Amino acid sequence: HVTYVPSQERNFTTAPAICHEGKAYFPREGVFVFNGTSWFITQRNFFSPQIITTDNTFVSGNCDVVIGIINNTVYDPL
Amino acid sequence: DDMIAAYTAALVSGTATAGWTFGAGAALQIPFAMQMAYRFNGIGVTQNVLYENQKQIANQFNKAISQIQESLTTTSTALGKLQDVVNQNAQALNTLVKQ
Amino acid sequence: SISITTEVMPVSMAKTSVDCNMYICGDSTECANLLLQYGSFCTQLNRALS
Ligand SMILES: *[C@@H]1O[C@H](CO)[C@@H](O)[C@H](O)[C@H]1NC(C)=O
Numbered sequence: 001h002v003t004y005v006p007s008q009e010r011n012f013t014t015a016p017a018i019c020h021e022g023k024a025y026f027p028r029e030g031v032f033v034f035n036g037t038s039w040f041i042t043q044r045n046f047f048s049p050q051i052i053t054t055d056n057t058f059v060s061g062n063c064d065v066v067i068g069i070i071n072n073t074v075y076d077p078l
Numbered sequence: 079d080d081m082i083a084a085y086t087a088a089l090v091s092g093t094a095t096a097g098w099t100f101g102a103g104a105a106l107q108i109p110f111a112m113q114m115a116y117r118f119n120g121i122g123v124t125q126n127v128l129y130e131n132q133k134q135i136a137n138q139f140n141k142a143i144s145q146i147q148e149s150l151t152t153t154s155t156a157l158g159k160l161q162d163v164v165n166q167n168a169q170a171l172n173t174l175v176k177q
Numbered sequence: 178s179i180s181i182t183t184e185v186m187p188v189s190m191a192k193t194s195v196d197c198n199m200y201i202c203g204d205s206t207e208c209a210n211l212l213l214q215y216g217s218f219c220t221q222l223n224r225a226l227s
């Protein structure tokens with residue numbers, strides 16, 4: 001049997017969702033990570049930082065019901 | 079029995095703290111709400127459903143545990159397939175004695 | 178293409194019972210009296226079959 005074993009763990013600061021002009025952005029697949037400067041989105045099994053854009057996230061509701069939501073910005077490609 | 083109890087306690091603690099990642103390899107820490115979100119995402123339901131109804135889901139979880147406890151405090155035959163083993167062993171030895 | 182394949186599986190077999198007294202001593206009183214001290218052996222077979 002040939003198998004894949006992950007290794008070399010690293011700790012990050014995470015959030016459930018992000019608020020942006022009164023709307024909540026949840027990731028499609030992946031997790032929100034913080035690297036000391038800004039917030040990125042990454043896959044759970046490998047570390048590959050990506051910029052949080054509108055393609056990465058989706059909108060559901062306003063920001064007064066989710067516990068632990070934070071303020072950040074979302075880059076629109078225009 | 080103490081060793082088996084320690085094994086089950088370690089498994090429940092690892093599930094409640096690390097989730098699912100300690101079987102593939104080294105344990106990865108994760109808060110319980112995000113793990114619940116992944117479990118919800120695995121059955122085809124988006125994770126905002128968890129994040130907007132967390133109080134109700136937690137209350138239903140606690141109520142179900144309490145109902146299991148109340149079901150197990152009353153005398154019943156829930157563990158009836160563990161009694162058959164000890165009955166069969168005792169009856170076989172007594173059958174040799176009577177034989 | 179769409180294909181349909183058949184698969185057959187057994188589920189149960191025939192339920193059976195035996196009677197020690199008739200198999201060993203058919204309508205004989207003396208044989209039944211002689212068999213009387215083997216009763217523990219016969220109840221084990223009936224328990225297994227049930
Ligand atoms: C955060 O990511 C950036 C990528 O632009 C990298 O340059 C930086 O070193 C990272 N922060 C730390 C603390 O490594």
Ligand SMILES: *[C@@H]1O[C@H](CO)[C@@H](O)[C@H](O)[C@H]1NC(C)=O
Nearest residue numbers: 019020021022069070071072
């Ligand atoms: C920033 O977050 C706080 C709570 O963490 C919130 O009260 C505030 O309104 C947010 N800022 C903006 C501009 O929405």
